[PDB]
Symmetry: C3
Subunit: 131 residues, 3 copies
């Protein structure tokens, strides 16, 4: 497994890391298998969604924020309980099928690191499962 | 990897593809392994839930709609951002353990393709790992 | 094969830390590098990975999920958490973040539950 380093900027943002997953796939030399993307953070996660217009990621973030605001019924008064919730909603990992040395995903389907508590120095693990 | 073509009807509906997955496993001959079901769309997803009482899936779709309505604070011009959100919530894939040549599912569990922007020409990928 | 654990849940909603049960399955498998798949065979419960230190974080997730979705409520919450989660096995150890715990998320207890743990490759 290889560990990539990520530098997030805004409090919450979607970072397209599809390039990072493909980098791991080439480096592995695997033609067929599985690519597992894991996020070791509890205030961030991984999701797969539209890679085209950034209006889609904006809508997801804004609306996730609307339903689970920064301020509210949170005994975890540290202020990022909302990020913990959203992290679980997106998921701690996502997997993509590897076919003919390529990630088998939709045309405009990209892999995102979903930051709900930036700016921070993050990590993302990528494991390529051969054959 | 096996690919199944699906033609969805309603703009939002849960399509039970458990048997489709089961057929992939049986035809693969694999006895012990892992079945990975992947949805290559950004306005649809894959989930596992109640396979008996149709009221359950109905309530999920309805509740998802109430919390994330078709019209609202959305900049995306296609007017389908509510679908993109629900897709990430259900997830782009799910996996099921294969034991003794059969899907190790709970008595009430069914695998669903969750369409949030139909009717459209969809696909589902099923990868059997051993 | 698969290692099945039984869990006896109590309160209506509860996050049960099963990180050790999973590590247990890992150590017993003998594998050094692979994948640990944790699967919940119930439609009113799920599996998620989140803060394993502060009890209020799980309390906030449960209560706020409840606020937005006040037993079909258990069914929708089960799908939001997910029916399964995957963890990288490296050096015969779960490659988890410092504050990451694996949780079985009960939304309709008290019940006799089960979690399956399959170690791959």
């Amino acid at each position: 497994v290889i560990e990539y380093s990520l530098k997030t900027s805004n409090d919450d943002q979607f970072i397209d890391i599809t390039n990072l997953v493909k980098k791991a796939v080439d480096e592995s030399g695997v033609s067929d298998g599985m690519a597992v993307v894991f996020c070791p953070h509890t205030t961030a996660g991984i999701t797969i969604n539209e890679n085209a217009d950034p209006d889609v990621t904006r809508d997801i973030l804004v609306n996730l924020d609307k339903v689970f605001p920064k301020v509210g019924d949170y005994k975890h008064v540290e202020g990022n309980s909302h990020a913990h919730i959203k992290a679980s909603l997106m998921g701690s990992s996502q997997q993509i099928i590897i076919e003919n040395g390529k990630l088998k995903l939709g045309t405009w389907q990209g892999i995102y690191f979903t930051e709900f508590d930036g700016p921070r120095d993050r990590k993302v693990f990528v494991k390529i499962i051969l054959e």
